[PDB]
Ligand binder design. Structure first.
Ligand code: CL
Ligand code: CL
Lengths: 362, 361
């Protein structure tokens, strides 16, 4: 109810799931007396109400990004500026309520429901060369409270639940950038692999949002779900030749863009399917990331391959705008209490669900 | 005199024939090849020079492979085989119009022309259905060649016939690479296989456009690279490349990599490229099949572009570059058509700089 009580209900210690080093789930410790951060100059402090799970959670913990010299070495994604320090609270897709504010900040902001932009840009221009993110370079949302810069706490003009709002920021920002890098236009066709996953699903929605035609490549039993989120046609990964199946599901239209989230043994086939002068784009490869590329296929077909992470401020604004105009919708695949993080991430890794899993403090 | 000229054009000629896929025994020097009659909209030229390109060798070998098998025997056009044997190869053709076909001005006879090897196959500027002369159609390794009239360009230059046979395939390819990588004035390009055709072309073309080229080349080729406009030269076989390039540039970042080598250099090239950088290729002489770490591409926000040949607009610009003397010919050797096996043996070993030229006789 009251704003004053809220301001003074903020405890000195809190509950949080801590990442304590690289390795397996046992490296994630549920702790009961972690210092509540104090908002520095230009920061707010939010009471976390929801936080959405992403692949980067898992890969950062495993150290599964490899290095340029050794693709199987353990490393965080930030290969050249390691800002990961242990213990670290992970969690990128944070929603909460501002309960405290730091030095330069308007005290009128207290009480606001905010969606966190997880991005640390590290530049004033629109370059993505030095990016980092909350949950990697700085503590994230798998805790009861989180500090973050005021500019990053967005008030969204929407009637959605805190949980619903927590589904968007990492995967949909990443989705948008991919679609922007590939220059996907109204009326074009995008083939989306890993379509039932975080980014996959988002791209299907974001494709629709900009007037494009998505065709999902989905696991067995996930077809009807892909249709539900706006896919034009679905191709089941299991059986058949992919190229034939894509041909039939497309009804003949050539594939302008491939959005790949799987990679691995699928990669070469996607380059085969892609129309000449077509564009390939990726921000993750779950199957995975080291592929055999026949340069000749790339240049005889006049192809572009694009790799992309996260997104720009303008991309984020557009995402906020999409949420507000309801051009995309939240996909809640399940909800887990913070106290049951191990169960949450096990379920997360299995991927026997659609859309996104959300972690709530308790 | 005028009548004499209508009938003085021989009915047979000599030409090097590609008879099938294989080694050099597939190139038969033949003295009795029918001289093509020019069809509607065509000219017939007396070839005086023709430049050598990697495609000659690769089409001969069928070393393009297939989508399903990277090492199957295959010509470059994997989805429309217009290569029929015997074929006369040779892309970079210069000559003199001796005859004109059905809808074409008689006045053109006597003109000195540079052949545009491109078969566009579309009205628009899409390269999706391209072919070339010397592959889809007979090329310039012959005394005479027929071609569409509009692909026969009178260039406004005092350049020698041999000099002019330096440009069209490698420089069109290079232009497109730069176009596809969006290389802007002030930006730095790292060019590998820099002493070869496309390599050298890109060095010149980057300067033509205000960019700063850094050459990666063979041992003892530093001086030749500087002479054709390279800012700095890195010598390929002496130390870590990233460190060498580091030292070679001002420490300044690499915006674009133009790669014609691939193979063992590929992953290294991706390391060196600045985040948000652009990689562009049209051939990989040291190995076209490479292991790519998608993580490197996506964490670094990279683009990779594959490109081949170029557009009509790209070609017009090339002519302009030649006329305005913004680029110059790099003749590395001239060879007679009768000694083709020697010419290609030299061509394949790359112990030269610039382009190799085959003159009939
Ligand atoms: Cl990955
Ligand atoms: Cl190649």
């Amino acid at each position: 109810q009251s704003m004053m009580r809220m301001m003074h209900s903020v405890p000195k210690t809190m509950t949080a799931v801590l990442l304590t080093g690289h390795g397996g789930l046992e490296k994630l410790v549920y702790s009961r007396d972690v210092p509540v951060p104090a908002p520095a100059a230009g920061e707010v402090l939010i009471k976390v109400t929801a936080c959405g799970m992403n692949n980067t959670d898992v890969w950062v913990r495993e150290g599964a990004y490899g290095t340029e010299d050794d693709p199987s070495a353990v490393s965080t994604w930030r290969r050249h500026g390691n800002t990961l320090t242990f213990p670290r609270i992970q969690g990128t897709d944070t929603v909460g309520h501002i309960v405290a504010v730091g030095e330069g900040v308007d005290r009128a902001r207290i009480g606001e429901r905010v969606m966190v932009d997880f991005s640390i840009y590290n530049r004033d221009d629109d370059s993505l060369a030095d990016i980092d993110y909350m949950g990697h370079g700085r503590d994230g949302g798998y805790a009861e409270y989180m500090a973050l810069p005021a500019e990053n706490a967005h008030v969204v003009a929407t009637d959605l639940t805190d949980i619903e709002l927590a589904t968007f920021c990492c995967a949909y920002l990443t989705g948008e950038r991919m679609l922007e890098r590939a220059r996907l236009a109204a009326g074009e066709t995008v083939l989306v692999t890993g379509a039932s996953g975080g980014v996959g699903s988002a791209i299907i929605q974001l494709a629709r949002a900009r007037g494009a035609v998505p065709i999902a490549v989905a696991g067995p039993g996930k077809e009807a779900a892909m249709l539900d989120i706006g896919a034009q046609a679905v191709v089941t990964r299991g059986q058949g030749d992919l190229a034939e199946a894509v041909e039939a599901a497309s009804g003949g239209r050539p594939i302008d863009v491939v959005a790949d989230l799987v990679g691995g043994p699928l990669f070469n086939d996607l380059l085969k399917i892609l129309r000449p002068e077509g564009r390939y784009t990726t921000a993750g490869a779950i199957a995975g990331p080291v592929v055999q590329l026949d340069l000749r296929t790339m240049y005889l077909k006049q192809l572009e391959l694009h790799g992309s992470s996260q997104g720009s401020r303008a991309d984020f604004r557009r995402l906020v705008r999409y949420i507000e105009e309801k051009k995309i919708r939240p996909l809640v695949g399940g909800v887990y209490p913070l106290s049951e993080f191990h169960r949450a991430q096990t379920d997360f890794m299995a991927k026997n669900f659609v859309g996104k899993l959300v972690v709530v403090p308790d």
